[PDB]
From Swiss-Prot:
InterPro entries found in the cross-reference section: Glyco_hydro_22, Glyco_hydro_22_CS, Glyco_hydro_22_lys, Lysozyme-like_dom_sf
Family matches, as PROSITE patterns: GLYCOSYL_HYDROL_F22_1, GLYCOSYL_HYDROL_F22_2
Protein's cellular compartments: Secreted
Protein name: Lysozyme C
Note: Lysozyme C is capable of both hydrolysis and transglycosylation; it also shows a slight esterase activity. It acts rapidly on both peptide-substituted and unsubstituted peptidoglycan, and slowly on chitin oligosaccharides.
Main localization category: secreted
Length: 129
């Protein structure tokens, strides 16, 4: 499904992403905005044959199994299709392990190029959280 801005922020907050590892909620909403346009069904193919899935575009090379990325790992121990549900639970739990792996939110290229160093607080503005 296609989340609204404040709708997504509320779902992420109740799933414990606000200030997770120091990253305020605005960073996550911004990341989702430019990775998937708030669409849980978004997919994108990469050059190496791997695929990015879901609202946060988590990559099959490392984090989920999609059965067609040879030599990949399944570090979130889930099928990549589980990242496309309208329930963001699996995506959020997997994102939590990605941000914890030492490189923070730099794992998301769109956050680094389009959210890092900006006023990310503007993305939860006006929302009732
Ligand atoms: Na994989």
């Amino acid at each position: 499904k296609v989340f609204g801005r404040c709708e997504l922020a509320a779902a992420m907050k109740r799933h414990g992403l606000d200030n997770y590892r120091g990253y305020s909620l605005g960073n996550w909403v911004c990341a989702a905005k430019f990775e998937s346009n708030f669409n849980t069904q978004a997919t994108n193919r990469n050059t190496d044959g791997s695929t990015d899935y879901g609202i946060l575009q988590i990559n099959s090379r490392w984090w989920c199994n999609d059965g067609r990325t040879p030599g990949s790992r399944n570090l979130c121990n889930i099928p990549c299709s589980a990242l496309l549900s309208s329930d963001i639970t699996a995506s959020v739990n997997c994102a939590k392990k990605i941000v914890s792996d030492g490189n923070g939110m730099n794992a998301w290229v769109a956050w680094r190029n389009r959210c890092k160093g900006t006023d990310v607080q503007a993305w939860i503005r006006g929302c009732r959280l």
